[PDB]
């Protein structure tokens, strides 16, 4: 085989300083993951994925560092119709991955310089479609103030004005209100499917980032 799973990972010191804060994107929209790695000595670059819903381990798409050919695509079983990209740019290479975000493809994506054994995580992106918030039984419904990226650790959406929320029952007396980006259907008609599990694989990272506006979310220690 061209390689195996990363035996010995590493993290760049800019890993947590350059990874953009989580992003909320409406279902059915064609997002693409950008990336920019300076000219290096690693034979292979790759994109590593961890889907939120019902997934464990990691799947890797490995591209030759210089030419841009494909050497191995593990994202197949979850992204049958995703198209990658590679653009040689003498100063430094660029590669990207495109798909149609939905409930089953939200997760973390990380550019990874690679060779046969080792790897070096460089950047992380978190893609979300539904976010959980809790409301007290009589308190009026909260009102977050999502905006475009701006800068910081605030969750953001490229289309904040298409924000809509729905409730999915109760939890320990609280009422679970979920936030999502709509307009996939006319006006308020569209209502996403109720989430089937929480906390999921992405719960740890997401809840470390603040959400602008007044709202209560269960938070890590």
């Amino acid at each position: 085989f061209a390689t195996a799973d990363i035996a010995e990972k590493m993290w760049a010191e800019n890993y947590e300083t350059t990874s953009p804060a989580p992003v909320l994107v409406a279902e059915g929209e064609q997002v693409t993951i950008p990336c920019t790695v300076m000219t290096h000595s690693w034979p292979m670059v790759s994109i590593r994925a961890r889907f939120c819903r019902s997934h464990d381990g990691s799947d890797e798409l490995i591209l030759d560092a210089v030419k841009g050919h494909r050497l191995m695509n593990g994202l197949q079983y979850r992204l049958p119709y995703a198209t990658w990209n590679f653009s040689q740019l003498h100063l430094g290479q660029i590669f990207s991955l495109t798909f149609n975000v939905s409930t089953d493809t939200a997760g973390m994506y990380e550019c990874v310089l690679r060779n046969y054994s080792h790897g070096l995580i460089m950047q992380r992106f978190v893609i979300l479609t539904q976010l959980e918030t809790l409301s007290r039984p009589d308190e009026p419904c909260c009102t977050p103030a999502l905006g475009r990226y701006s800068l910081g650790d605030q969750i953001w959406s490229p289309t904040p004005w298409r924000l809509r929320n729905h409730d999915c029952g109760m939890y320990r007396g609280f009422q679970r209100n979920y936030f999502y980006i709509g307009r996939a259907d006319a006006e308020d008609c569209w209502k996403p499917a109720c989430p089937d599990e929480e906390p999921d694989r992405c719960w740890t990272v997401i809840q470390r980032y603040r959400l602008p506006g007044d709202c209560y979310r269960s938070q890590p220690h």
Partner: peptide
């Protein structure tokens, strides 16, 4: 509640079934 058992596994077939999933 439903979950996708053994997603992307090597020796096992992935299936979609009703389940009690708790992480």
């Amino acid at each position: 509640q439903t979950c996708i058992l053994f997603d992307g596994h090597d020796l096992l077939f992935s299936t979609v079934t009703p389940c009690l999933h708790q992480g």
